[PDB]
Amino acid sequence: GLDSPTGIDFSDITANSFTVHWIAPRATITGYRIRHHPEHFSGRPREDRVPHSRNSITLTNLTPGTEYVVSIVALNGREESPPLIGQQSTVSDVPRDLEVVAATPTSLLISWDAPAVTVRYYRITYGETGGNSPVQEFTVPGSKSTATISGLKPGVDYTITVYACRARGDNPDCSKPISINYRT
Numbered sequence: 001g002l003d004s005p006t007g008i009d010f011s012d013i014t015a016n017s018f019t020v021h022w023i024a025p026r027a028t029i030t031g032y033r034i035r036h037h038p039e040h041f042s043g044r045p046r047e048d049r050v051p052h053s054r055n056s057i058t059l060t061n062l063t064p065g066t067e068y069v070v071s072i073v074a075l076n077g078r079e080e081s082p083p084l085i086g087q088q089s090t091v092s093d094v095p096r097d098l099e100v101v102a103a104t105p106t107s108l109l110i111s112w113d114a115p116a117v118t119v120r121y122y123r124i125t126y127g128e129t130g131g132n133s134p135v136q137e138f139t140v141p142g143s144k145s146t147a148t149i150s151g152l153k154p155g156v157d158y159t160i161t162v163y164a165c166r167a168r169g170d171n172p173d174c175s176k177p178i179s180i181n182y183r184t
């Protein structure tokens with residue numbers, strides 16, 4: 001059988017990419033086949049054919065906060081090696097630890113922790129839990145991870161959600177949201 005590559009390693013990890021490295025087998029090879037998929041995904045992995053002279057690839061268009069399974073197979077014409085497998089997560093872009101830090105009868109001060117990415121702005125939404133009531137939205141600058149919500153009703157359950165939004169492409173790229181409930 002054809003010996004596998006060895007020494008899988010990862011570098012330059014971001015929310016949407018990372019670089020994968022490996023060491024060629026002590027064998028004749030004609031190329032590599034690299035596959036990657038989010039863990040537990042039941043469908044087809046993404047695939048790249050890499051030249052035999054190469055020992056790394058940067059994988060892009062990845063989803064934040066996700067562990068990927070990466071498989072590298074050496075090829076020698078018809079033959080394939082068993083795969084060299086590694087698991088690496090991308091950085092999460094989702095805020096953490098959303099909480100109400102203070103309350104008055106009609107206002108809530110909320111606070112959270114920034115994700116480890118460059119946030120352009122946060123979007124805050126809030127509405128009465130279970131109300132036919134309008135959901136309301138506003139933003140805060142990405143440099144600040146607190147907000148004050150005003151104009152609320154006392155004695156009412158509210159759902160409050162925060163998104164971290166980055167501004168890189170055709171649309172802002174906003175994280176999955178984090179939510180809490182709080183009764184004024």
Ligand SMILES: [Ca+2]
Nearest residue numbers: 039067068087
């Ligand atoms: Ca896992």
